[PDB]
Design an enzyme around this catalytic site. Structure first.
Site, PDB file in Angstrom:
ATOM      1  N   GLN A  42      14.574  22.207  11.590  1.00 53.86           N
ATOM      2  CA  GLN A  42      15.832  22.575  11.661  1.00 53.86           C
ATOM      3  C   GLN A  42      16.688  23.130  10.538  1.00 53.86           C
ATOM      4  O   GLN A  42      17.715  24.596  10.081  1.00 53.86           O
ATOM      5  CB  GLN A  42      16.711  22.221  13.052  1.00 53.86           C
ATOM      6  CG  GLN A  42      17.706  23.335  13.422  1.00 53.86           C
ATOM      7  CD  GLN A  42      18.631  22.044  13.823  1.00 53.86           C
ATOM      8  OE1 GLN A  42      20.550  22.513  13.483  1.00 53.86           O
ATOM      9  NE2 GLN A  42      18.968  21.171  14.876  1.00 53.86           N
TER      10      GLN A  42
ATOM     11  N   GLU B  51      10.162  22.205  17.308  1.00 53.46           N
ATOM     12  CA  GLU B  51      10.791  22.380  18.758  1.00 53.46           C
ATOM     13  C   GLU B  51      11.315  23.639  18.599  1.00 53.46           C
ATOM     14  O   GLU B  51      11.794  24.511  17.569  1.00 53.46           O
ATOM     15  CB  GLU B  51      12.474  21.183  18.127  1.00 53.46           C
ATOM     16  CG  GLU B  51      13.861  21.295  20.028  1.00 53.46           C
ATOM     17  CD  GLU B  51      14.275  22.800  19.463  1.00 53.46           C
ATOM     18  OE1 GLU B  51      14.534  23.497  18.533  1.00 53.46           O
ATOM     19  OE2 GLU B  51      14.757  23.279  20.931  1.00 53.46           O
TER      20      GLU B  51
ATOM     21  N   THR C 233      10.820  14.797  12.330  1.00 57.61           N
ATOM     22  CA  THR C 233      10.375  15.562  12.677  1.00 57.61           C
ATOM     23  C   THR C 233      10.058  16.893  10.810  1.00 57.61           C
ATOM     24  O   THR C 233       8.593  17.104   9.911  1.00 57.61           O
ATOM     25  CB  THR C 233      10.677  17.387  13.431  1.00 57.61           C
ATOM     26  OG1 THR C 233       8.983  18.439  13.038  1.00 57.61           O
ATOM     27  CG2 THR C 233      11.584  17.405  12.742  1.00 57.61           C
TER      28      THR C 233
ATOM     29  N   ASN D 245      24.470  26.304   3.397  1.00 54.68           N
ATOM     30  CA  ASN D 245      22.963  27.640   3.420  1.00 54.68           C
ATOM     31  C   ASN D 245      22.693  28.557   2.378  1.00 54.68           C
ATOM     32  O   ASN D 245      21.816  28.333   1.785  1.00 54.68           O
ATOM     33  CB  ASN D 245      22.590  27.826   4.393  1.00 54.68           C
ATOM     34  CG  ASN D 245      22.401  26.770   5.351  1.00 54.68           C
ATOM     35  OD1 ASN D 245      21.672  25.694   5.312  1.00 54.68           O
ATOM     36  ND2 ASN D 245      22.713  27.157   6.804  1.00 54.68           N
TER      37      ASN D 245
ATOM     38  N   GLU E 113       6.957  24.994 -16.686  1.00 58.47           N
ATOM     39  CA  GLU E 113       7.655  24.671 -17.792  1.00 58.47           C
ATOM     40  C   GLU E 113       8.939  23.766 -17.726  1.00 58.47           C
ATOM     41  O   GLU E 113       9.960  23.836 -18.467  1.00 58.47           O
ATOM     42  CB  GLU E 113       8.416  25.646 -18.929  1.00 58.47           C
ATOM     43  CG  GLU E 113       6.821  26.592 -19.468  1.00 58.47           C
ATOM     44  CD  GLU E 113       7.681  27.284 -20.438  1.00 58.47           C
ATOM     45  OE1 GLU E 113       7.154  28.413 -20.779  1.00 58.47           O
ATOM     46  OE2 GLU E 113       9.066  27.735 -20.903  1.00 58.47           O
TER      47      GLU E 113
HETATM   48  N1  LIG Z   1      22.420  21.755   4.723  1.00 64.13           N
HETATM   49  C1  LIG Z   1      22.368  21.996   5.865  1.00 64.13           C
HETATM   50  N2  LIG Z   1      21.863  20.383   6.488  1.00 64.13           N
HETATM   51  C2  LIG Z   1      22.136  20.040   7.739  1.00 64.13           C
HETATM   52  C3  LIG Z   1      21.432  21.759   8.708  1.00 64.13           C
HETATM   53  N3  LIG Z   1      21.580  21.279   9.838  1.00 64.13           N
HETATM   54  C4  LIG Z   1      20.183  19.698   9.496  1.00 64.13           C
HETATM   55  N4  LIG Z   1      21.227  19.475   8.572  1.00 64.13           N
HETATM   56  C5  LIG Z   1      20.781  17.848   7.989  1.00 64.13           C
HETATM   57  O1  LIG Z   1      19.562  17.423   9.008  1.00 64.13           O
HETATM   58  C6  LIG Z   1      19.598  15.461   9.368  1.00 64.13           C
HETATM   59  C7  LIG Z   1      19.539  15.858  10.814  1.00 64.13           C
HETATM   60  O2  LIG Z   1      17.720  16.771  10.979  1.00 64.13           O
HETATM   61  P1  LIG Z   1      17.397  17.853  11.749  1.00 64.13           P
HETATM   62  O3  LIG Z   1      17.445  19.413  10.118  1.00 64.13           O
HETATM   63  O4  LIG Z   1      19.582  18.598  12.000  1.00 64.13           O
HETATM   64  O5  LIG Z   1      16.169  17.950  12.604  1.00 64.13           O
HETATM   65  P2  LIG Z   1      14.764  17.814  12.070  1.00 64.13           P
HETATM   66  O6  LIG Z   1      15.133  17.436  10.937  1.00 64.13           O
HETATM   67  O7  LIG Z   1      14.318  19.574  13.039  1.00 64.13           O
HETATM   68  O8  LIG Z   1      14.929  16.337  12.408  1.00 64.13           O
HETATM   69  P3  LIG Z   1      14.624  16.264  14.603  1.00 64.13           P
HETATM   70  O9  LIG Z   1      15.757  15.608  14.509  1.00 64.13           O
HETATM   71  O10 LIG Z   1      13.232  15.747  14.559  1.00 64.13           O
HETATM   72  O11 LIG Z   1      14.470  18.051  15.229  1.00 64.13           O
HETATM   73  C8  LIG Z   1      21.414  15.976   9.637  1.00 64.13           C
HETATM   74  O12 LIG Z   1      21.821  14.323   9.774  1.00 64.13           O
HETATM   75  C9  LIG Z   1      22.379  16.542   8.486  1.00 64.13           C
HETATM   76  O13 LIG Z   1      23.030  17.219   8.039  1.00 64.13           O
HETATM   77  C10 LIG Z   1      22.298  22.805   7.629  1.00 64.13           C
HETATM   78  O14 LIG Z   1      21.985  24.076   8.392  1.00 64.13           O
HETATM   79  N5  LIG Z   1      22.521  22.613   7.073  1.00 64.13           N
HETATM   80 MG   LIG Z   2      15.473  19.176  15.438  1.00 60.97          MG
END
Ligand SMILES: Nc1nc2c(ncn2[C@@H]2O[C@H](COP(=O)(O)OP(=O)(O)OP(=O)(O)O)[C@@H](O)[C@H]2O)c(=O)[nH]1
Ligand SMILES: [Mg+2]
Ligand SMILES: Nc1nc2c(ncn2[C@@H]2O[C@H](COP(=O)(O)OP(=O)(O)OP(=O)(O)O)[C@@H](O)[C@H]2O)c(=O)[nH]1
Ligand SMILES: Nc1nc2c(ncn2[C@@H]2O[C@H](COP(=O)(O)OP(=O)(O)O)[C@@H](O)[C@H]2O)c(=O)[nH]1
Ligand SMILES: [Mg+2]
Lengths: 430, 430, 182, 430
Positions: free
Chosen positions: D11, D62, D136, D219, D245
């Site tokens: 995500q 997801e 994931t 972002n 490099e």
């Molecule tokens: N910088 C930034 N970090 C994010 C963002 N969305 C989620 N995170 C970070 O991602 C961490 C959790 O992983 P996620 O990306 O939300 O979910 P995932 O990687 O898809 O893993 P799943 O829970 O199995 O779906 C959280 O602790 C957030 O700090 C975002 O939009 N920007």
């Molecule tokens: Mg997710």
């Protein structure tokens, strides 16, 4: 390629900074928006296209004055993030602004000072303004001076402090923090100028003929004095003087650098033009004891050195012919070990007038900065006021409970006693 | 051939040069754009004395301008004839000395002087046959009196056989503009006697007296004092740039006016000088020139020449005139005043005639006399120095930059020894 | 220790180590405790309180670091100690000694500060000085320092609870001193 | 003929990919429909007539985020069958996305990667984005990196991972999978950049003056950093830098490739134009510890090598004059065995602004990628957090029941201990 940075801390400091910054903007033709519709470089900086930014920083823990500044006509002039403001006031407590709440703010101010200094290439020195009889003013001024003395070292710093009047006072506890701040800046500031309010009230009453003055009228006169002092850096003159050329001419010894100022002429447009305002009469008026900018009597002490600035169409020979007359008079006597005591500066730009103000437009003016032995009286009377309440330890609990030690009051008393002994030791003839 | 280069330092020296070069350019018919527009053939024959030649046919002075602050040279460039100076010769620092001799001679002046010495060496190595150098500076300022005198020693160390001129303005006690004048005057006189081949003292007080009494103009300014000094400066080297009955370069004057190597402090004067309203009354004759030439009020110094006896004298007549009259008048001015001429050296007046008068005048005279009356200036300077030094006033400024009191004691002792041994010959009899 | 010494030597121009502080006053209160507060422009040290006697001997090594002015103040403090609760109820300034170390003979290991109150001499402190040119509150601080050595993270939940306990206790001790001084 | 492929998984990865893909389309003039109304070739491919297709692939188990992408304004841009989507989420369980459901999806992703790679002729390397604290994201990133490291071999891969904040956290189990993913990418990724959210929150609060930021604001800053890093491949510059490099300039040893980034200037249009934004001040701001893009203090450790990119009208001499100033400062110290540590790149294209965003338009910007010894603190604190719960074997049953072995947790701990020992061993002087 010559620059100077002015520091404004406390309510009185900010209110006199506003007063000097209308005057500078008016004198260099810059509109209140900061836009002109090579002399500006001393106080300002060019942004590349358009507006000019002052080389000044405003400090206060109490937000009301800064908020008033940020909504007036000058909202567009100052950089938005150099008006450092706190949340809680020190409330006339010196220990608060030196130990409790000033420490968390001083780092931002020092970062701003560094960011302003890296821009300058020929930095002459610093200016600082602070009313001494207040908590945040005295405490933050002391802390900033102490940090700057070690961050930069030999750079010159000038302090335009406003000591309390002999009998007129607004607070009840101002002798304590006045004495402590004098302790702090005695070993940390190169020049200190006396500015108590009572003398300037008398000046306004006698000359300007105003019977109900406010603080703005006082601050305009102070701004005029500052402009006269710094005119030589940004205008062509027959006899120039720099800031660094002071401790070699007015400061006989490292401890003795408190001096009192005077200005002339001070006159309203209703009766200014009826008299010729010759250089001799203005230089006589400047030496009158009643025209001192601090409530001290020069007849009670010797002179050590006099540095006095002219501006306008004055000719050097007329200046010499008037210095001779003053040396002639029997009521003004210099110290034995100083045969000549005058440093003279001449500038061509006449003083500028602020619209709606008190002073009129004139072609000649004189500003004197004189170091005299008579200044010890203010120290003696402040010491006497301090001792009365320190005998019973009154109001001390408001300071001990803010982190300050019990013994810190005594050593300031000892340093004042040392200063008073030094002033007596210097004034005796050989 | 036998040309000299110009080197000036400090604000006072720069202002003197700004009029000296204007006078020279007007004499040689050089426009402020560097283009010759003169009338006479003789105006170009010996132009190599002061001016260099560049492509495009324009002329550029071989002057070197130095100061510890950029303001004065940034101001002289905008004045008339300011474009003649080569931009490469401008050397300056970013700090200044603040009228402190130690800063301009030990800490700041030592590091900067390499760059100015580079261009000085470039100028001297190139020229056809060197005659020497002439120096204009003031003894009342820090950067000037320090850097100029150290440069004197550096130049003397590399060119021991060339001749060296110095036109030095000493601080008079009457018109005092700086409180620390005695210190840097006494320190400078110590070094100046050891290296300068010729020295010519000039006082602002004497210039004001002359302007007020002889010219009788209401409002003297620095432009008039500079013009008088410039005319006196030009009068000395006139016969080196023009033909005459008896040519006499600077070295010939050095031979005939200095009896002993340490007695080379002269006082000068220029004639004729008349008011605007009386310029039609007077008739220019050799007796009229010689009676004004030896007049006491006409000297460029406040020293009274009938308070001592002349060791020797010199006169540089200008214009076309008979030599018999000049010689008989010189004899008459020496027979009627035998009491004021030392008796163990007979025929102690030197004369010279140049056939080219100044532009606008038919006759002119420049007077250079070595007299014992100059002791009074060193006496009063040392008196003020010892009055101020006994209390160690303002001493910390000097001692904080590596200097000590021993160099003050040695300077005072050497100056007093000079004063004594200069008057030793006044009481000497055959 | 080498890195801490290097950081100290980079910040300060010199150090003075003060040892063997002997207090003598013209009059002691036999029921009062006394401590010395040794201070400069850069900080302050405190001795342990000792019971009033004709001469008191404070043990400890006091490293005083300078960056300019070489003056030390020795404040003599009187303390009322509650014997039941082992806390300081009030602190009263008896007098101030000044040691000016530009006047301290580098060859004399023993130094004397004259103690003054309101300009009158009331005693002296003698000390040894060496010069180099370059749960109790203590138990809670030692537990915090031992957690700082064990945890790679500056803010463990346990450390935060101990810092809150320490702050609450310092406020109580300050209140007890303010109550004893009334 | 130079190409790069970006991989977005999870995500957070997809939400930062959206952020970078508005910016690239805006910077190359491509409308959201993909139609233009030779620099595009680095990120895009020409279809023969009309639209451009990004060289990017979106991965997630997801479906919500992908469905949001496929219905927004950018539905026409991406190829319909490179937005690989699953049915069941891993639910923050690392073992799920590495052993249970990720294996059945990874084959399609690898087929898409091959189909995209066969089109490129000058493939520079891969980019990958993944938030580490998720099931994931971390699991599929690990599996994809492990497959790519053997399918392609020596091709360079860059990882823009977002580690959890020191104290701020959204999940409760993220240390476990963060440690496991660090284990996986330690021996499999050439570059890893630190991106924790707390530091960027502080940056937004202090500079952008936003008190309620959302993920989009974070972002956008990350997208700007990516654009600054990859600008040198698609725009003309005086001093170019390629992706290949880097391991020759920032990676002293194969194990040490975790570094932290910073960006400057960050300022809003309301007060941007009041100050000149010189190169010296921006390069000073970039090195400020408070402007690090990861919450680590550089004052706690040495520097190893600094690679820092400029873009705009910057001149190399001004860059050198600012690198010298930084080498001068005493608060920034480099490691002993590295005399010079700076790699400088200069590009001409100024940063592009996104409408409705936070940042204003400026002509100069600087992006630094710095490798420092202080990074070990985040590893130490993550290790401490891991040990607390692994002591009691909490939450382990959620991992053992998804096919992972019991001992797999210990070896990640051993590798982190080895990394921490290596960082200490490198930072000691010889
Ligand atoms: N910088 C930034 N970090 C994010 C963002 N969305 C989620 N995170 C970070 O991602 C961490 C959790 O992983 P996620 O990306 O939300 O979910 P995932 O990687 O898809 O893993 P799943 O829970 O199995 O779906 C959280 O602790 C957030 O700090 C975002 O939009 N920007
Ligand atoms: Mg997710
Ligand atoms: N000359 C002059 N003096 C002022 C002015 N305003 C305040 N003062 C003096 O300042 C003293 C008290 O300090 P203030 O400046 O008012 O307050 P402060 O310095 O900000 O300290 P705090 O009370 O903690 O806020 C008073 O005794 C006044 O005499 C002013 O506008 N002009
Ligand atoms: N003749 C003349 N004298 C000047 C002029 N300006 C200043 N002075 C003299 O120079 C003295 C001060 O010297 P100063 O400017 O401090 O020299 P500096 O330290 O080298 O810059 C004063 O006493 C003046 O009398 C000028 O324009 N003409
Ligand atoms: Mg206030």
């Amino acid at each position: 390629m010559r620059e100077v940075i002015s520091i404004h801390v406390g309510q009185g400091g900010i209110q006199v900074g506003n007063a000097c910054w209308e005057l500078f903007c008016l004198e260099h033709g810059i509109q209140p928006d900061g836009q002109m519709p090579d002399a500006f470089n001393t106080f300002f900086s060019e942004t590349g296209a358009g507006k000019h930014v002052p080389r000044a920083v405003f400090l206060d823990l109490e937000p009301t004055v800064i908020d008033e500044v940020r909504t007036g006509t000058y909202r567009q002039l100052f950089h938005p993030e150099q008006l450092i403001s706190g949340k809680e006031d020190a409330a006339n407590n010196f220990a608060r602004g030196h130990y409790t709440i000033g420490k968390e703010i001083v780092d931002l101010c020092l970062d701003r000072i560094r960011k302003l200094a890296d821009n300058c290439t020929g930095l002459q020195g610093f200016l600082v303004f602070n009313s001494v009889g207040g908590g945040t003013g005295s405490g933050l001024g002391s802390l900033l001076l102490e940090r700057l003395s070690v961050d930069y070292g030999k750079k010159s710093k000038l302090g335009f402090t406003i000591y309390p009047s002999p009998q007129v006072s607004t607070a009840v506890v101002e002798p304590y923090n006045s004495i402590l701040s004098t302790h702090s800046l005695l070993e940390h500031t190169d020049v200190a100028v006396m500015l108590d309010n009572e003398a300037i009230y008398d000046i306004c009453r006698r000359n300007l003929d105003i019977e109900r003055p406010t603080y703005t009228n006082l601050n305009r006169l102070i701004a005029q004095v500052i402009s006269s002092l710094t005119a030589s850096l940004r205008f062509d003159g027959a006899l120039n003087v720099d800031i660094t050329e002071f401790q070699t001419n007015l400061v006989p010894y490292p401890r003795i650098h408190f001096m009192l100022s005077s200005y002339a002429p001070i006159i309203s447009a209703e009766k200014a033009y009826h008299e010729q305002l010759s250089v001799a009469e203005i230089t006589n008026s400047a030496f009158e004891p009643a025209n001192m900018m601090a409530k001290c009597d020069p007849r009670h002490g010797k002179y050590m050195a006099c540095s006095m600035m002219y501006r306008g169409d004055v000719v050097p020979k007329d200046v010499n012919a008037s210095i001779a007359t003053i040396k002639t008079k029997r009521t003004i006597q210099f110290v034995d070990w100083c045969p000549t005591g005058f440093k003279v500066g001449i500038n061509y730009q006449p003083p500028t007038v602020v619209p709606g103000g008190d002073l009129a437009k004139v072609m000649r003016a004189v500003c004197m900065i004189s170091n005299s032995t008579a200044i010890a009286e203010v120290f003696s009377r402040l010491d006497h006021k301090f001792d009365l309440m320190y005998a019973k330890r009154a109001f001390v609990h408001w300071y001990v409970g803010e982190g300050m030690e019990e013994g810190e009051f005594s050593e300031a008393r000892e340093d004042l006693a040392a200063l008073e002994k030094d002033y007596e030791e210097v004034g005796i003839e050989t | 051939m036998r040309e000299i280069v110009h080197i000036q330092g400090g604000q006072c020296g720069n202002q003197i040069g700004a009029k000296f070069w204007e006078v020279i350019s007007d004499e040689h018919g050089i426009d402020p754009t560097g283009t010759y527009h003169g009338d006479s053939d003789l105006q170009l024959e010996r132009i190599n004395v002061y001016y260099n030649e560049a492509t495009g046919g324009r002329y550029v002075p071989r002057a070197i301008l130095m100061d510890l602050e950029p303001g004065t040279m940034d101001s002289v460039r905008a004045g008339p004839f300011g474009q003649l100076f080569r931009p490469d010769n401008f050397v300056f620092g970013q700090t200044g000395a603040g009228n402190n001799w130690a800063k301009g001679h030990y800490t700041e002046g030592a590091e900067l002087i390499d760059s100015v010495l580079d261009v000085v060496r470039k100028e001297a190595e190139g020229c056809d046959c060197l005659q020497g150098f002439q120096i204009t500076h003031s003894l009342g300022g820090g950067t000037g009196s320090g850097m100029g005198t150290l440069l004197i020693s550096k130049v003397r160390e590399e060119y021991p056989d060339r001749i060296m001129e110095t036109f030095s303005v000493v601080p008079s006690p009457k018109v005092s503009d700086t409180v620390v004048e005695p210190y840097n005057a006494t320190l400078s006189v110590h070094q100046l006697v050891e290296n300068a081949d010729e020295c010519m003292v000039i006082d602002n007080e004497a210039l004001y007296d002359i302007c007020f009494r002889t010219l009788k103009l209401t409002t003297p300014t620095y432009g008039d004092l500079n013009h008088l000094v410039s005319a006196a400066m030009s009068g000395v080297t006139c016969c080196l740039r023009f033909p005459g009955q008896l040519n006499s370069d600077l070295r010939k004057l050095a031979v005939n006016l200095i009896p002993f190597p340490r007695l080379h402090f002269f006082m000068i004067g220029f004639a004729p000088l008349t008011s605007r309203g009386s310029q039609q009354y007077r008739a220019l004759t050799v007796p009229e020139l010689t009676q004004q030439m030896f007049d006491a009020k006409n000297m460029m110094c406040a020293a009274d020449p009938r308070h001592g006896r002349y060791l020797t004298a010199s006169a540089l007549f200008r214009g076309r005139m008979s030599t018999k009259e000049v010689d008989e008048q010189m004899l008459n001015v020496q027979n009627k005043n035998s009491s004021y001429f030392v008796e163990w050296i007979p025929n102690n007046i030197k004369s010279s005639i140049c056939d080219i008068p100044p532009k606008g005048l038919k006759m002119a005279v420049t007077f250079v006399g070595n007299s014992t009356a100059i002791q009074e200036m060193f006496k009063r300077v040392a008196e003020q120095f010892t009055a101020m030094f006994r209390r160690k006033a303002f001493l910390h400024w000097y001692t904080g930059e590596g200097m000590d009191e021993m160099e003050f004691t040695e300077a005072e002792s050497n100056m007093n020894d000079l004063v004594s041994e200069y008057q030793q010959y006044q009481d000497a009899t055959a | 220790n080498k890195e801490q010494i290097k950081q100290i030597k980079s910040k300060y121009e010199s150090c003075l180590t003060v040892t063997n502080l002997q207090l003598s006053l013209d009059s002691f209160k036999p029921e009062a405790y006394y401590y010395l507060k040794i201070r400069n422009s850069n900080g302050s040290h405190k001795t342990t309180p000792q019971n009033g006697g004709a001469s008191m001997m404070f043990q400890g090594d006091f490293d005083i670091y300078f960056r300019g002015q070489k003056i030390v103040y020795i404040d003599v403090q009187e303390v009322l100690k509650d014997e039941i609760l082992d806390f300081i109820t009030a602190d009263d300034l008896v007098g101030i000694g000044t040691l000016d170390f530009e006047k301290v003979d580098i060859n004399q290991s023993q130094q004397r500060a004259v103690i003054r109150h309101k300009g009158k001499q009331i005693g002296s402190v003698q000390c040894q000085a060496s010069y180099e040119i370059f749960q109790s509150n203590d138990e809670l601080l030692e537990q915090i320092k031992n957690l700082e050595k064990k945890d790679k993270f500056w803010l463990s939940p346990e450390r935060y609870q101990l810092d809150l306990k320490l702050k609450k206790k310092q406020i109580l001790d300050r209140r007890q001193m303010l109550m004893k001084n009334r």
